[PDB]
């Protein structure tokens, strides 16, 4: 029969970057990124994934695809 139930195929993994610019959003399931400003938000530098209450009082996470890529200088061993 219809082996398909109606599922969307996504190829997204995770965006790793550091906060640089500052953009505002109006999404409840997301959070606006700030430019290395002073706010209460656990923004991931080596990763574009943040989660906390920004200066806008809003809390959420986003691939902050509006910042400068971040590469982990150091490396790990087996």
Looking at the DSSP assignment, which residues form a beta bridge with residue 53? Answer: 59
Whole-angstrom CA distances from 48 to 8, 11, 54, 58, 65 are 24, 17, 15, 17, 7
Way it was determined: NMR
Question: What do you get for the CA distance between the two ends of the chain, in Å?
Answer: 47
| CA pair distance 36, 20, nearest whole angstrom | 6
Give the CA distances from residue 60 to residues 37, 56, 77, in Å, rounded to whole numbers and listed in that order.
Answer: 17, 11, 33
Q: How many CA atoms lie within 13 A of 3 on its CB side?
A: 0
| Cα 10–chain centre separation | 17
Fold exhibited by the domain 16-70: SH3 type barrels. (2.30.30)
Q: What are phi and psi of 69, to 5 degrees?
A: -40, 150
Q: Torsion-angle region of residue 61: left (phi > 0), alpha (psi -120 to 50) or beta?
A: beta
């Amino acid at each position: 029969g219809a082996m398909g139930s109606g599922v969307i195929l996504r190829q997204e993994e995770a965006e790793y970057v550091r906060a640089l610019f500052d953009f505002n959003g109006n999404d409840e399931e997301d959070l606006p990124f700030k430019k290395g400003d002073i706010l209460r938000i656990r923004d991931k530098p080596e990763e574009q994934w943040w989660n906390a209450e920004d200066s806008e009082g809003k809390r959420g996470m986003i691939p902050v695809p509006y910042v400068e890529k971040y590469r982990p200088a150091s490396a790990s061993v087996s």
